[PDB]
Design an enzyme around this catalytic site. Structure first.
Site, PDB file in Angstrom:
ATOM      1  N   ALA A  34       0.793  -1.231   0.000  1.00  0.00           N
ATOM      2  CA  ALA A  34       0.000   0.000   0.000  1.00  0.00           C
ATOM      3  C   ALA A  34       0.812   1.261   0.000  1.00  0.00           C
ATOM      4  O   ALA A  34       1.835   1.372   0.611  1.00  0.00           O
ATOM      5  CB  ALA A  34      -0.946   0.002   1.174  1.00  0.00           C
ATOM      6  N   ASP A  35       0.349   2.283  -0.715  1.00  0.00           N
ATOM      7  CA  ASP A  35       1.020   3.557  -0.755  1.00  0.00           C
ATOM      8  C   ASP A  35      -0.039   4.397  -0.096  1.00  0.00           C
ATOM      9  O   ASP A  35      -1.136   3.894   0.065  1.00  0.00           O
ATOM     10  CB  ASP A  35       1.256   3.975  -2.189  1.00  0.00           C
ATOM     11  CG  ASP A  35      -0.037   4.358  -2.901  1.00  0.00           C
ATOM     12  OD1 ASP A  35      -0.685   5.302  -2.433  1.00  0.00           O
ATOM     13  OD2 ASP A  35      -0.368   3.707  -3.923  1.00  0.00           O
ATOM     14  N   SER A  36       0.343   5.625   0.282  1.00  0.00           N
ATOM     15  CA  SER A  36      -0.500   6.570   0.981  1.00  0.00           C
ATOM     16  C   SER A  36      -1.989   6.651   0.600  1.00  0.00           C
ATOM     17  O   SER A  36      -2.848   6.696   1.458  1.00  0.00           O
ATOM     18  CB  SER A  36       0.064   7.990   0.827  1.00  0.00           C
ATOM     19  OG  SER A  36       0.011   8.407  -0.547  1.00  0.00           O
TER      20      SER A  36
END
Ligand SMILES: [Zn+2]
Ligand SMILES: [Zn+2]
Length: 76
Positions: A34-36
């Site tokens: 996951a990214d932001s």
């Protein structure tokens, strides 16, 4: 279906990972890629799925599959 299955399906949908990868210990960022924005829309997904707002200070701890489950369970 259970809240637990509902939560895992959502994390799966939101992080684009196959169900078997959505383990209770799995960390969104570290383990699930996951990214932001992924973590932001996931929490957004959980709020709509269970029709409930998640305060920021509680949301910030939702960093693992288990943490997501514990939050939703704790809130009924
Ligand atoms: Zn349950
Ligand atoms: Zn890890």
């Amino acid at each position: 279906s259970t809240i637990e299955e509902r939560v895992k399906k959502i994390i799966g949908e939101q992080l684009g990972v196959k169900q078997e990868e959505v383990t209770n210990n799995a960390s969104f960022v570290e383990d699930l890629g996951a990214d932001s924005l992924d973590t932001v829309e996931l929490v957004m997904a959980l709020e709509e799925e269970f029709d409930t707002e998640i305060p920021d200070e509680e949301a910030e701890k939702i960093t693992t599959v288990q943490a997501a489950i514990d939050y939703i369970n704790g809130h009924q």
